[PDB]
Amino acid sequence: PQNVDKILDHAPLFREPEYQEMLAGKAKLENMPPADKVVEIADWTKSWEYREKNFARESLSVNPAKACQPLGAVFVASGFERTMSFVHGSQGCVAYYRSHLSRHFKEPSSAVSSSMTEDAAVFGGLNNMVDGLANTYKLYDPKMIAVSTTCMAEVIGDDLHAFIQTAKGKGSVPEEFDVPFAHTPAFVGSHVTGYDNMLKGILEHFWKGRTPVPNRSVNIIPGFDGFAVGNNRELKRILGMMGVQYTILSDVSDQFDTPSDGEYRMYDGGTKIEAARDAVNADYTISLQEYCTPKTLEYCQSFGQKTASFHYPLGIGATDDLLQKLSEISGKPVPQELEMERGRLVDALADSQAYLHGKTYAIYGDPDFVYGMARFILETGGEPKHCLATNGSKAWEAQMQELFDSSPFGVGCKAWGGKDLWHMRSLLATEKVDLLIGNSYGKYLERDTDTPLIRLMFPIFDRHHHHRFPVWGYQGALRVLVTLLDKIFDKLDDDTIQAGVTDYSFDLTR
Amino acid sequence: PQNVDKILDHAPLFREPEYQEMLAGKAKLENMPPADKVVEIADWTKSWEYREKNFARESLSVNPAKACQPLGAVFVASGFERTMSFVHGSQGCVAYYRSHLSRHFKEPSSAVSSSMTEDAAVFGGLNNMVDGLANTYKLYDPKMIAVSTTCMAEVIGDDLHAFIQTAKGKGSVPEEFDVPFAHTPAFVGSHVTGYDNMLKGILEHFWKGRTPVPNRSVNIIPGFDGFAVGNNRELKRILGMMGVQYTILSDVSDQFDTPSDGEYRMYDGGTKIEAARDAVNADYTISLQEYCTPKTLEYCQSFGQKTASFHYPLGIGATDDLLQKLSEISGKPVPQELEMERGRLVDALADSQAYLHGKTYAIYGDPDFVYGMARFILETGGEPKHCLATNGSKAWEAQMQELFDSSPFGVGCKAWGGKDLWHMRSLLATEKVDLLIGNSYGKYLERDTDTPLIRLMFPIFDRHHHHRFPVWGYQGALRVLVTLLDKIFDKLDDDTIQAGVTDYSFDLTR
Amino acid sequence: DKTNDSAFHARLIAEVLEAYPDKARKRRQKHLNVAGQAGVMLSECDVKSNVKSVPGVMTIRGCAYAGSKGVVWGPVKDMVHISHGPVGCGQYSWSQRRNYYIGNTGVDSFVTMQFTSDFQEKDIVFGGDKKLEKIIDEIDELFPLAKGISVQSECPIGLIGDDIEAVSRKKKKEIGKTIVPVRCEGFRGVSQSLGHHIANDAIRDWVFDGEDKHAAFETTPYDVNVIGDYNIGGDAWSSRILLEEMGLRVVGNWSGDATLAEIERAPKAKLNLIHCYRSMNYICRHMEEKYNIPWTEYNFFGPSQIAASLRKIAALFDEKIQEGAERVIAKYQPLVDAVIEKFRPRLAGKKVMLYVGGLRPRHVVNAYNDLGMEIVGTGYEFGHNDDYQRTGHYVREGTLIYDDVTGYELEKFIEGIRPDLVGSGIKEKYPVQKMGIPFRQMHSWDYSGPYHGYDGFAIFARDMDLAINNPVWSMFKAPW
Amino acid sequence: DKTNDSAFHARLIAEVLEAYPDKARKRRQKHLNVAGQAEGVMLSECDVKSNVKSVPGVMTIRGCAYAGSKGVVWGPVKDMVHISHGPVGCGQYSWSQRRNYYIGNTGVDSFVTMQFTSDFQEKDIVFGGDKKLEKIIDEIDELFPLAKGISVQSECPIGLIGDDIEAVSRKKKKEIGKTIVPVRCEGFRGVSQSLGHHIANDAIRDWVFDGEDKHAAFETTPYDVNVIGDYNIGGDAWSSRILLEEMGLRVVGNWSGDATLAEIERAPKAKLNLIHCYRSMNYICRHMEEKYNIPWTEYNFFGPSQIAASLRKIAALFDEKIQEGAERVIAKYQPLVDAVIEKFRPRLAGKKVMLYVGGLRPRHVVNAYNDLGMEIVGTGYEFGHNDDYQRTGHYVREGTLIYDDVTGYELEKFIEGIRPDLVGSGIKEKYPVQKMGIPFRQMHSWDYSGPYHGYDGFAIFARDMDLAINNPVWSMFKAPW
């Protein structure tokens, strides 16, 4: 029963006898399979026979770990000064893009739709653009409107450039007002592709047909990042200590971490519009995530920028490599406070490596996260046995394989590009691993296969505020390290907490 | 059996059938109580009848949460520039003080003993001091030697001042060389008392009979702190942003977090010897932990310093109060970057408060930790039902009660001074709470009473590197917050992970 | 310090209308109003509804796919629901609606999963029907306990002229399991609403339109279907216990915790108890024409409505069921009394603004009143004229009413009114909290619930209390 | 850089001696030496003075007699409550830090991982603590009724203030009918943990053996042994026992890891004492040969060479049947030994190890390191006696650097100089050594791993030395700029 002194919400409530009895009663008329049949098919789904068939799939995706392009577009556009994402297309999309981001950051996510309906299939979506741009500009006072497209607008084939010019012709926005656009078709690639497409679209808008006035500064693109808030602050702290001349292109770190102080800030922070315009002058542009920027880096290359791309740098080596590149670009040495942070991270790893050596992992997410995570794992003596990226290409699989080959703890490790979490389930069932590194969808894999989850990948929906803390840098590597160790110790205490049976090993000191 | 492809260490190994069978065989000849008798007494130990008797104890301590004074002495002395703790007394003490600290920080802890043996009971310990000081000085090149006492040296009554002067007379150390001393009797108070006694001893050494040349700066004493490494760095960051003129008296943040880079640093960082000497000039001295400093603040008052003492400031209000006091002292306003951090912490708390409101806690540790933790809990809408401090006085119980009365979520709450973790066990057994905040000894309470532990108090032996991260400040308050939430969410997923029985509530988004 | 609420709300309407360009202003002016003056009607909520959203205004609405896959179909536990089109829609809608169910997920139920055709460019160019055929085979192999499959069409499907109905006909024969193609592409309609109508008509056309199939089912004079309770946080379970205790038999609850068998049998019942009028009156109207099964509206939010509902429903049967109603109302009185005594002192006099989809913006009001709280503003994402009509049974004159409200308008109305509570969705939550105003999600129940029924009412009150009467608000202003 | 090891070690001895004042130097010069040529078989002679006062202020690694008594001998006895008698310190620091494993419900039928203390205040120092102890014993009787006995582990003040804990123990044993063992293990006695051992052994004799025989009902066999001095570190004594049982012996009691008071009480009924830790418990084994005529033998279960030699040596004391069992056990575990050696010897052979532990392990583990191709280039004891150094020459090669009661200064300088591939010592040595870029494994706690004894142990031992030496962290010490 319910009780006002100790109120039972859904979780404990439906375990009470009256509901257990009513639910048993309901089950008798549900025509669901009998309990012996469920056990049979459950065990079968964890079998090798099933894994061969599951991996024989050609058409069906089940539990993919990726979103569609416009999510990436909204994300990247949200890291520019007072910029509103305008997704030309159907509006249900925008409800979803926003909800998804909000559930992850526990923050507002602002975006608007051109609200194309069925008629736009016959007449095209011009009026939606013209009217939409007008209303978005008047209501939400953006400095820039960043147009992307839903899959309906792509199939219909609307000419965005023409539409935007028509809109300016009719006075929807000032003639000189900034309306960069990009095609972001959901049926190509994923959200990382939309990050790239929208970012190029923005840069092309400000750079088209200009001649650089070269400077020695570096543009840094962080890419699609669940940990954007802490990571970008760590990045800035690092760059500041080194004294590097830089511009971050797309910084959502303030936008998705505004204070609760009586005012709601629709926009906050961002790459300044003027800095985006002067970014064409930089001699370098580095991407922290290759797979978020290939089109954008090619475009930067078209203005004679030298380009470098990393893979979500996590841990000692990856950070070292980033710092060395920054040092090569800026001419500035790595300062002693950063060697200390480094030496202290090494110290943590050395103190704790008995618990990491030999551990086996499954890892999934965006291709760059997975590379960078797997690499960090190898530094610890761990084995990234099952690496998986639904949005991972063959070129990625080759890069992963090169990473595996660089270390003796790589023997046996595989990278599964274009596979999904139903595939991952069969891996975890048949070739057990100690730990799963992924995102909140991975809780279902924890449930189905008794493989504990560590959340280091977008989206994190069932934990709060992890995004506020870095994973990049030496500081961030230490957080990751402690996050692993905490999951590991803890599993050790749970393995040894049963009095007189297992608690011989319940050590006070570990 | 054992197997070289998957090696079984102690935990899985003794669960193998052959060892289970051999252990059953051993048990038959152990003459231990039969299993029905164990169940009977176990249940009895969790009863109210037992709790009345357990609380009727007058002489026996079981599982106290405190150490003895010299630990606090060694700790505080280790936060001065190239300072070696010299504990005059028996040497087994020093092995223990060092091991205890090392197991917590995963770091070296350096300290020496005068190595008093039985004969010192009849002849006194002079030669031990003279010879000891000589050898410590020549071998370990300290800038200062900080003498404390083990309980044997106290009982024997050695005159430390005389002995140290005799030592200088015989050329053990240079005449002007700094050898502050303090009586640190294990049989009075606890480790917090030795922190106070040794710190006073050090200050008295440099201050005795001098006249201040007043300045507007503030001496800050952090006290005995398991999180000294992150906290002192957070403290310094805050003070820097505010532009306060300060001196930290005893800063072990570098000493217990040296890098692993090929050199072993016996000493690193610390309050400079000169700054300790000029600290007498400050108009203010604030202690961040009252119960670590009453003798030291009284001494500072004897040079006309104004003093303030806090209770391990955790969360919004306590940090606000510290910042305001700093602002009052320095004349400088709180800068906007700190209002942002504050506003962001408030935002985290508001986003997440559904999971904190109504939660009930048991909390134990040093008196100031417990106060500060309980206070933070009340900000979240939690109830600090069982607060306990083995080293907590009646004056502390009154202060805790004033804290409880300040908020409607304090109604049930009690503060149990001078009780131990066996007492706490009976509280947890009879009046269940959601969560236990303590130290690693609390894992035994997790085992005995199914109350999950959160480790925010010295010592943390079974987790690694938590000390590297702050709990003070707005940043630290956000870590604590996320540490609570994470424990709460793990627990929610564990309550709901059993397929078809409890997983109706296994929400993807929380 | 002092205001007149009707006139202050009319001012707030005028303020927000000034921010629009003239074209958008003319379209929006008919969606905003103050309730005028007129069981019983308290007020008249005269506002235009269920038309195009205006472009670029930051509407809160979803699409027909949400209404069909997310709302009606996705909760059916023993079917695989194919999100047909590119990966997006099925990712965003994966496990976000807390339409609870008992099952082994992946094995005998498929709710908290994404099944998708993951359209690539080749699929847009050459069509996706050959892909769907292959998909269905692959589902049949790998999820053999699935009693059926639905094909939830995302935007491209209709735009490229794919024939999913041909495929469904073809594969139902081939595999002997029901296949339901739904034309819930987002470009259809203006909102989630049409997704409901389309989905309801898909139930009629591909589930009811078939053989036998449960001729073995024993009936009683007390058999009902509960239509349109999607079991949010177990809402339908805490509704069902009361209906059973009153003496009814619940043949099927649509569609929370529902199996295909339960839905298939709905024609065998004597009466449809419709909770969510908006999402499922369509199938109830069909069920009155074809089978002669009448429907009735009820409401299980708060003790007033639950009592009135239990009595209204029981009056449709006989003495025996009427006595059970009174027994259920009497049984739960100590609980109701205990909740009211604990929480009404803490909440009475507090002002609430609401914004939800198509039912809750009126349906929860009475439960707020049972705790002494007043609703000063309410509104629907996708209500129809008949939902606004019914809103006047619940809100007082002077209540600010807003249909398909914009981010701009809603922010300005919340800033102006400063209610004690806002009840709306995930995209509204965080800005409102940032303004220093308590907020409780009225879709997901903020990961709590149930709120339906008596066991629900306690939890509902606890939740509104814990959001409003919390120490966090006093700490917004820094002390300097 | 080429070197001669014996002469390099002698140089390192000279370097460190130069850092001391003359008085400390004269005392320390006799504790440091290089193993000479020899005067089973003796490999070398480890001529070093031992078991005397530590020099003040030098950063000795030694503990006190309370460690030796409460921490080492007594505290592992599972079904007794051990009172740490004096102020709160000693019992806090020693609480659950030695991994002397046991099966029990802790708090209920066993009391190992707990601190029981009299928590001496100033009133207790001034007016004596005996009245407090009496009250404490009553309180233990009430609240831990399944405790079959109580020990009173004296901390420094007890003897200094003239408290009579023996009077109290006599009085309360009559009053509550449960054994009470007062131990005079105050830290001011002796020079180290060693005297704590002798004192604790003599307390077993005087307050457990000295009583009405509690077990006249015990059925004996010709194959009954006690295992004496294996404290079950990470389950070491359990992996030792399975081999002794499989060989055909019956283990009456294992002292004192996983031990009950009953098992200890019965030790006189056995036919033979198998002593592993010679240092801690030869005392009670000598008593048991004089009083009961039960002979003792030394064995060693670190690594396959020693385990085989030990199983055979022990079996040769019985008959044909037990000798055949030895061979069966050695044969049974050969595939395991072979597998460990093939996996891990290639990864460890040729690597140089320095050791420093208490009283047994500094020699006893050497042969297991050699079974993996590793050489010991330095070893030493906290509190070894002359007879431990004597026996060390059965294990270490000539030219091994030997250090008794080594100082922090000396040990740091020897590790910096030798740069071994591994150091095996304690918690207070671990972290500095890792900071120097040198792998380290704890040779007391087994770094929270184990067991290392026996065959099942040897696998885990090899895994652990491999994972500390052969891991990627070392290559990352030098930053790439």
Ligand code: ICS
């Ligand atoms: S179905 Fe409708 S928007 Fe009636 S689409 Fe929506 S689970 Fe709302 S006001 Mo989300 S017509 Fe249900 C609804 Fe109401 S998803 Fe839920 S809360 S009672």
Ligand code: ICS
């Ligand atoms: S008892 Fe002794 S110091 Fe023989 S006091 Fe010490 S668990 Fe050492 S070398 Mo810690 S004489 Fe045991 C020992 Fe050896 S605690 Fe352990 S490892 S084999």
Ligand code: CLF
């Ligand atoms: S109205 Fe259309 S049915 Fe509705 S939710 Fe939008 S797409 Fe889908 Fe967007 S999110 Fe991406 S771009 Fe196409 S696939 Fe899915």
Ligand code: CLF
């Ligand atoms: S040689 Fe003496 S028996 Fe040995 S460990 Fe030292 S005290 Fe104890 Fe120190 S730690 Fe404190 S001061 Fe006394 S109480 Fe316990």
Ligand SMILES: [Fe+3]
């Ligand atoms: Fe937020």
